[PDB]
């Protein structure tokens, strides 16, 4: 993994994320939602669990993006949890949780759940 | 379980559900959100997995409520997945998914996730 994870990944909706997998489990980079403007770039930080594998398993990882930059402050944050699978068609399969800041009465409906698959192509 | 499940359950937000656990895995009843009017009662249907247990495990179950009745049509449905634990302080611990009907562009944000614990008191 590590090397394999480092790079640019794209999902099915048009988002892109560029990440660097550092020697001791760190993931750092940027997530960009769309248009192709600085206004859609947000910082992302996460971790990955590097393992000796002898049976083709995926590498578990996760990262967070707080939706605030110099052009937008969406009062929310998204975390993606999944695994990296390398090879010809390397992909990162994830499930995500997006939570928005709410008042306590609305807390019950503050989190959305979904999934995303990212590829290098 | 079965017998133990049959009855009225209340959650921490004020909702109440009355359910009948039928001999062959069926769960049928009503869910009521609040006020104490017919307008908050919705039909619920689900299933439970009845097991010989020799080690104190919970009974897995799940049910669905479509948010439509003669007074409201919220264009959504909620499913609760969890387990029944009986005894002095019997409870049903669940995680739920609420999906609203959306257009395809908004599908990505159509499902909320949460948890609920129901008790007999």
């Amino acid at each position: 993994a590590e090397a394999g994870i480092t790079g640019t990944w794209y999902n099915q909706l048009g988002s892109t994320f560029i990440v660097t997998a550092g020697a001791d489990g760190a993931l750092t980079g940027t997530y960009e939602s769309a248009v192709g403007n600085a206004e859609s770039r947000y910082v992302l930080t996460g971790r990955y669990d590097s393992a000796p594998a002898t049976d083709g398993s995926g590498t578990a990882l996760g990262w967070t993006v707080a939706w605030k930059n110099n052009y937008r402050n969406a009062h929310s944050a998204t975390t993606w949890s999944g695994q990296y699978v390398g090879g010809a068609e390397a992909r990162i399969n994830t499930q995500w949780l997006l939570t928005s800041g709410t008042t306590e009465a609305n807390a019950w409906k503050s989190t959305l759940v979904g999934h995303d698959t990212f590829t290098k192509v | 379980a079965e017998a133990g499940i049959t009855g009225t359950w209340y959650n921490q937000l004020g909702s109440t559900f009355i359910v009948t656990a039928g001999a062959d895995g069926a769960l049928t009843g009503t869910y009521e959100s609040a006020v104490g009017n017919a307008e908050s009662r919705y039909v619920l249907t689900g299933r439970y997995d009845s097991a010989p247990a020799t080690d104190g495990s919970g009974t897995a179950l799940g049910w669905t409520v479509a948010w439509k009745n003669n007074y409201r049509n919220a264009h959504s449905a909620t499913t609760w997945s969890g387990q029944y634990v009986g005894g002095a302080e019997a409870r049903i611990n669940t995680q739920w998914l609420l999906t609203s009907g959306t257009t395809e562009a908004n599908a990505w944000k159509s499902t909320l996730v949460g948890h609920d614990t129901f008790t007999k008191v």
């Binding site: 909706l13 048009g14 988002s15 939602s33 769309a34 248009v35 859609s40 947000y42 993006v65 939706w67 937008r72 969406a74 929310s76 998204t78 997006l98 | 562009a105 908004n106 990505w108 944000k109």
Partner: peptide, 8 residues
């Protein structure tokens, strides 16, 4: 119009 969707 959330930053996690398209576009924006």
């Amino acid at each position: 119009c959330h930053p996690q969707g398209p576009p924006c």
